[PDB]
Design a protein around this ligand. Sequence first.
Ligand SMILES: Nc1ccc(C(=O)O[C@H]2c3ccccc3C[C@@H]2C(=O)O)c(O)c1
Length: 167
Amino acid sequence: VNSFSGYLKLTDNVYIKNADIVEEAKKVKPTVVVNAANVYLKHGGGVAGALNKATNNAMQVESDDYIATNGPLKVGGSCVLSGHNLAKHCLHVVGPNVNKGEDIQLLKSAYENFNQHEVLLAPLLSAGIFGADPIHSLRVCVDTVRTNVYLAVFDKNLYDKLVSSFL
Ligand SMILES: Nc1ccc(C(=O)O[C@H]2c3ccccc3C[C@@H]2C(=O)O)c(O)c1
């Protein structure tokens, strides 16, 4: 048993909800919240900017120190950093950004990072302002992640479309 509530059941291990992921993280304080990061960990907008804002910019301060030491991530890669006031850990995962012209095939590699964690609260990688079709991202998630993933979809109208079209 875990503390996630009101999620629809898509598969044995994938659950989904219409929620603001920042507000969800605050309530649950999950072991792992996934950030939809870029390779520079520059948390300007989207999930990244919103989580970062909720940490009072402490996520960005930590991230800049990480990059100064380690250099950028790979598209498809990840790093584990603090979850600050939102979660124990934040898994920063870089999905391909279609609006930057990155290869959507890398989405599966991005979701494979989730398998290193038993339970996660996460967004649909590469969707939203990253430019991919959320229906596709959800399909790749279900077909790649084997650990227990609790997906938050910010937009109610898209959430209903994702549920109604899910095979
Ligand atoms: N408080 C919040 C929470 C989330 C977002 C957001 O953009 O998230 C979308 C986002 C952003 C970037 C990549 C993928 C996704 C999917 C996610 C969604 O639409 O579910 C926001 O701007 C403010």
